[PDB]
Amino acid sequence: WEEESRRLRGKDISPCRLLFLDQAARLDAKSIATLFELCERLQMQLIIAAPENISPEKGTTYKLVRKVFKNHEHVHVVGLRGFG
Amino acid sequence: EELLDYRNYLELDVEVNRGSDGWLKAESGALSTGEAIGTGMSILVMVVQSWEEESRRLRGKDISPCRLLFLDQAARLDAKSIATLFELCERLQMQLIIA
Amino acid sequence: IERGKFRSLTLVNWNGFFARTFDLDELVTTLSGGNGAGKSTTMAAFVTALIPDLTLLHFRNTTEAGATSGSRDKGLHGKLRAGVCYSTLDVINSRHQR
Amino acid sequence: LIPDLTLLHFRNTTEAGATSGSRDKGLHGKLRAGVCYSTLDVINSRHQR
Amino acid sequence: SSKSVANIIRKTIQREQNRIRMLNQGLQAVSFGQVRGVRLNVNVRESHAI
Ligand SMILES: Nc1ncnc2c1ncn2[C@@H]1O[C@H](COP(=O)(O)OP(=O)(O)OP(=O)(O)O)[C@@H](O)[C@H]1O
């Protein structure tokens, strides 16, 4: 799709690239490493989700916790870091 | 012929006490993956228990049919949900094969 | 050439989120949390921001992905709170325009 | 457990309810040339193996 | 015969409701995400009750 639109677009713009993957826990470490290397080689941004932090040493990570609070809900977001 | 069956006279629904809210009808679209998986397992064990209850009267009084279920791609569940599932299966004496 | 990038995703008055801005990564952004944390909600909010066509938006569970569930509900309404809500994307263009 | 060719369909976990797409049921490619066996062992309430 | 048919339908409905309510007790307090309980709601449709 990017290649086809190369004519209509201006010579100075490269379109943004982004994909998703929910339930990433279905992939093992080797597969996720391969996916990461592919995406970075293709300058592809990825937003992945998994109950457990399956990618601790790459990109940015967030952890979400839902709390019942006075008869409603709130999500608390905490950043995570590879090493401490 | 549909009217001739008593079951058709009954309306059956699946309700979940989701969070702070009361009991809501279980809609696949209004739940997360883990919640749907867990509710599915709950209904499956309900079905197994109902089938055993129905079949008991046509079986030897000292026969308890085996109960065994699967769960593929279990990684979609967190530790808490997995522990709850294990507790449920143990309470129901039900064998699990989880991948 | 320098390809544009998605800096961040902001969620306003969403189910669970009042006003939360996740700063996206240049390569990979990961979201973790137990079941029902709200990751799928974030994905849905992003895609809604990307393709606001209401006919297309259908948030089926990962289970029954593409299997007709006959719920009659696309699932987006229950993911929003009463009142106004917003879903926005900041993008740095290859022309370095925010 | 259920040795019926009509019902046995080992579609991928993805597309768990989606249409066939292809015609294969995915069982043949899981076997090897020759004679194979799949057996369960059960202990009844009567303790018959 | 019609009265007997109606009575037997009613009796079977009551028995099944009781059995389902009994089974429901085991699913009380199941913690799944934000889900805390599961119930099988059984009811008699008006279109058939009348
Ligand atoms: N349309 C909706 N109506 C009602 N509740 C909803 C709706 N969408 C999401 N929820 C609830 O909001 C919470 C977060 O849902 P969501 O699917 O975003 O979570 P998640 O982090 O993706 O979960 P999981 O990883 O287990 O799939 C859950 O309690 C879910 O039941």
Ligand SMILES: [Mg+2]
């Ligand atoms: Mg999810």
